[PDB]
DNA sequence: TTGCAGTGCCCACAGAGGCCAGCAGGGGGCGCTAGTGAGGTGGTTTTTATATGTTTTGTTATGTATTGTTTATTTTCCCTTTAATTTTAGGATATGAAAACAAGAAT
């Protein structure tokens, strides 16, 4: 529910940045597929990536599934709906996305795994 | 004149072939109808589309609360100066205790 963590008032953002970093030191797997959750619930799709799911088949059928299961009420998106709560919400969301990449900038960045899907999925999307 | 060898004629029943009704062969043209097949029109609904009313969303303005700012009255740390207050002899007191005297008592 890294979604929901940054999204209801995150007490401190680099503490969670922290926290994907030691997840990510423990298993590249599940704190990869914690980051693309995050992004996906981002986008306002209420799906949820699994394991499997994300580790075996592509980027683009999973785009294609996640439209299919975009699983809306509303046409509003997490970028345009009303105002504060989702105002906080998109800022979270950038300074999480800045410090996180920002933080890893030293070692973790050059083990050349987690930028090749990333880029694949958000070029794709 | 006759017997014999050969001819004439008349009939008749077969033999034959045209005449005729009967009958079957292939094909041309009409009387009438059941049964679909398709095409056109009308009705129905229906579905898209359009417009109106209500409500939801976004924007604006005012009031309250929070943070900051130079005063500003504590306040408090640090002097030099007294006002109790304490300490050390120095004399006087007192209350005791021997010491001498006087008074019973004994020898």
Known sequence: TLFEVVKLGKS?????????????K??????LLDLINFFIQC??????????????MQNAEIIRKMTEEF???????????????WKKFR?????????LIRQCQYSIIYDEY???TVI??????
Do not use: H, K
């Open 12 to 24: 401190a953002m680099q503490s969670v940045v922290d926290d994907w970093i030691e997840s990510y």
């Open 26 to 31: 423990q298993d590249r797997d599940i704190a």
């Open 43 to 56: 986008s306002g799709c209420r799906g949820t990536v699994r394991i499997e799911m994300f580790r075996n």
């Open 71 to 85: 699983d809306e009420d509303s046409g509003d998106y997490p970028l345009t709906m009303p105002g504060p709560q």
């Open 91 to 99: 800022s979270n969301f950038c300074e999480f996305i800045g410090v």
């Open 114 to 116: 987690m930028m090749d």
């Open 120 to 125: 694949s999925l958000l070029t794709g999307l």
